[PDB]
Amino acid sequence: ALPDFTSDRYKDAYSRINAIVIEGEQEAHDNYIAIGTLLPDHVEELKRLAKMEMRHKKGFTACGKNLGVKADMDFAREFFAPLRDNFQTALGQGKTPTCLLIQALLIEAFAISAYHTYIPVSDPFARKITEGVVKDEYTHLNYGEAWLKANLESCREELLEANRENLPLILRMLDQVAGDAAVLQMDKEDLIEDFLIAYQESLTEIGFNTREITRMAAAAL
Ligand SMILES: CCOCCOCCOCCCCCCCCCCC=O
Ligand SMILES: [Fe+3]
Ligand SMILES: [Fe+3]
């Protein structure tokens, strides 16, 4: 059944969830602009994708305002800190495949799963915004997916290392927010299932086989 969107219990859990989604969108904008320094020939497409995230950030900001909820931005900044730190380290080292696996694959699959799970349990205002985010988010092949498919043979080992370091951070992020997600009527198992399917699909597209993907998904533990 649908949660009571007016209760203090819902508003409290929404304050952290909403803030995480808002921060995720801001960091996605910053990340695609940062990737532009590593891929100067991709600047215009990256600027277009960065503008999409700011549109989503504004949409999700309005979701919190509509419910009369103040987003806990400090919690959101700390929530993203381990993953943000690893992105910055890869960026400074000029590690384009790592930067792309973090933002274009892991964060996008994390967002897709979250949005798909939230839609059937969301309030009418937030439902239209979220459905609008999914039915617009991107093209057939993502700036990262397509890039990683084209450059796989030169970056296979870096991708396996990036997955090993960053996939457990995504797992820990979900564990940290599973309680608040449950208040919003979202099942943790539905979030895990959807994320793994979306991540498996992108890896298959890039060029990894069943055995390689199995080994990669196993890095989460
Ligand atoms: C391996 C287990 O990990 C599964 C993670 O499932 C996803 C759970 O996410 C629920 C928290 C909601 C946060 C959404 C993040 C929004 C980020 C938007 C950035 C856009 O590019
Ligand atoms: Fe987004
Ligand atoms: Fe995105």
Ligand 1 lining (C-beta closer than 6 Å): 20-21, 24-25, 28, 107-108, 110-111, 113-114, 170-171, 174, 177, 181, 191-192, 195, 220
- The answer to whether 5 and 123 are in contact (CB under 8 A) is yes
| Terminal alpha carbon distance of the chain | 32
Residues ≥6 apart with Cβ < 8 Å to 213: 200, 203, 204
Which DSSP string corresponds to 12-78? HHHHHHHHHHHHHHHHHHHHHHHHHHH-GGGHHHHHHHHHHHHHHHHHHHHHHHHTT----HHHHHH
Maximum CA pair distance of the chain? Answer: 53
Closest residue to atom 10 of ligand 1, CA basis = 114
Task: Kindly report each contact of residues 82-89 with a partner whose C-beta sits within 8 Å and lies 24 or more positions away, as own/partner.
Answer: 82/169, 82/172, 83/107, 83/166, 83/169, 83/170, 83/173, 84/27, 86/165, 86/166, 86/169, 87/31, 87/34
Report resolution (Å) to 1 decimal: 2.2
Kindly report the length of the chain: 221
Q: Which of 69, 53, 68 is nearest to 19 (CA)?
A: 69
Tokens of 18: 């909403």
- Rounded to the nearest 10 degrees, the angle between the axes of helix 124-134 and helix 108-118 is 140
Question: For residue 177, how far is its CA from the centre of ligand 1 (angstroms)?
Answer: 10
Nearest to 79 by CA among 19, 165, 9, 162: 19
Which residue's CA is the closest to the ligand 1 atom numbered 4? 192
Measure the CA–CA gap between 67 and 76, rounded to whole angstroms.
18
Residue 207, by phi and psi: left (phi above 0), alpha (psi -120 to 50) or beta? left
Q: How far apart are CA 213 and CA 199, in angstroms?
A: 9
Which domains, from first to last, does the chain contain?
7-221 (1.20.1260.10)
**Locate tokens 């995480």: which residue?**
20
- The encoded tokens of residue 4 equal 């009571």
Backbone φ/ψ region at 200: left (φ over 0), alpha (ψ -120 to 50), beta: alpha
